[PDB]
């Protein structure tokens, strides 16, 4: 199936909230991050589709990045998400 369908089928809330709490918060968070990796892993090709999954997390939280600065910060956290889940950062992935 397409990455379009694979990513939309998943619940990215734990991933988006995990990132938001760190950037906007400059235990529950290991279970929230653990649930994040569980949701990514449910994708049939989770290593492929990782770019789309990160782009969808960013698209989902964009309205809440009220600042020129918050957007850099969200991006670094996002970019570190794949390694946190024992995947590799994707290769042609523009998060802007």
């Amino acid at each position, epitope marked *: 199936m397409s990455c379009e369908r694979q990513v939309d089928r998943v619940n990215l809330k734990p991933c988006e909230q995990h990132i938001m709490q760190r950037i906007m918060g400059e235990t529950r968070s290991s279970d929230q991050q653990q649930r994040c990796c569980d949701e990514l892993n449910e994708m049939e*090709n989770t*290593q*492929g589709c990782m770019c789309e999954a990160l782009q969808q997390i960013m698209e989902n939280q964009c309205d809440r990045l009220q600042d020129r600065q918050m957007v850099q910060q969200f991006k670094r956290e996002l*970019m570190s998400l794949p390694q946190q889940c024992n995947f*590799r*950062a*994707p*290769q*042609r*992935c*523009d*998060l*802007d």
Partner: antibody, heavy 121, light 106 residues
């Protein structure tokens, strides 16, 4: 260490197909995309497209959309370029290149020795 | 198609600094990489615009519509063809500049 060994030089008649192969070694195949770039004698570098060995996904440059196929083989860490409907504009040395970088960073860190394919009757 | 434009040739006095420009619309907002190629050899990356990849004599910069490769204390071994390279996320194409033949004075 990182090593890219391409197939020998080839000559093909106009309108025929050429298949170029590139065997990689010394790194974890499926961790990096492989690209094909050509150079007509005395000309610039021209990107053809790429394949991801982890998914078999490809992206081809517009010029070759419909005449090029790339495939990847995990049993021997080898990728393939296949170009059909050849004309003399296609004579060039063909390089495989190993990509490097993530996200918005995408360059070439290793290359094969090149394969000169001449299209001539 | 996204086009990178380079001067075709360039002569540089030995021991001086070389600046090779690579022109394209809004190029400074992309990552720009540079290759050197010698006769009969595959290209070799000399500037990698990577944060993962000790300083050397090769340096790249960008502003507005121009990317520039700088070569310090230019040497005879720096002769060759230099290519700039990007990845355009809008088209998902790798793009090379035309190339600049750097000949070193003597």
């Amino acid at each position: 260490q990182v090593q890219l060994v391409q197939s020998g030089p080839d000559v093909r008649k106009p309108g025929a197909t050429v298949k170029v192969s590139c065997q990689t070694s010394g790194y974890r195949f499926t961790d990096y995309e492989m690209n094909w770039v050509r150079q007509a004698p005395g000309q610039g570098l021209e990107w053809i497209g790429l394949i991801n060995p982890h998914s078999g996904d490809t992206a081809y440059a517009q010029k070759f959309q419909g005449r090029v196929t790339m495939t990847s083989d995990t049993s021997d860490s080898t990728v393939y370029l296949e170009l059909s409907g050849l004309t003399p504009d296609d004579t060039a040395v063909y390089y495989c290149a190993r990509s490097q970088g993530t996200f918005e960073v995408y360059y070439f860190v290793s290359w094969g020795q090149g394969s000169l394919v001449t299209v001539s009757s | 198609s996204y086009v990178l434009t380079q001067p075709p040739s360039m002569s540089v006095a030995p021991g001086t600094t070389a600046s090779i420009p690579c022109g394209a619309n809004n190029i400074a907002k992309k990552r720009v990489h540079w290759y050197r190629q010698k006769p009969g050899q595959a290209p070799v990356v000399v500037v990698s615009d990577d944060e993962d990849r000790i300083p050397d004599r090769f340096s790249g910069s960008k502003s507005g519509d121009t990317a520039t490769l700088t070569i310090s204390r230019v040497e005879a071994g720096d002769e060759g063809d230099y290519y700039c390279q990007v990845w355009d996320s809008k088209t998902d194409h790798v793009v090379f500049g035309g190339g600049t033949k750097v000949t070193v004075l003597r």
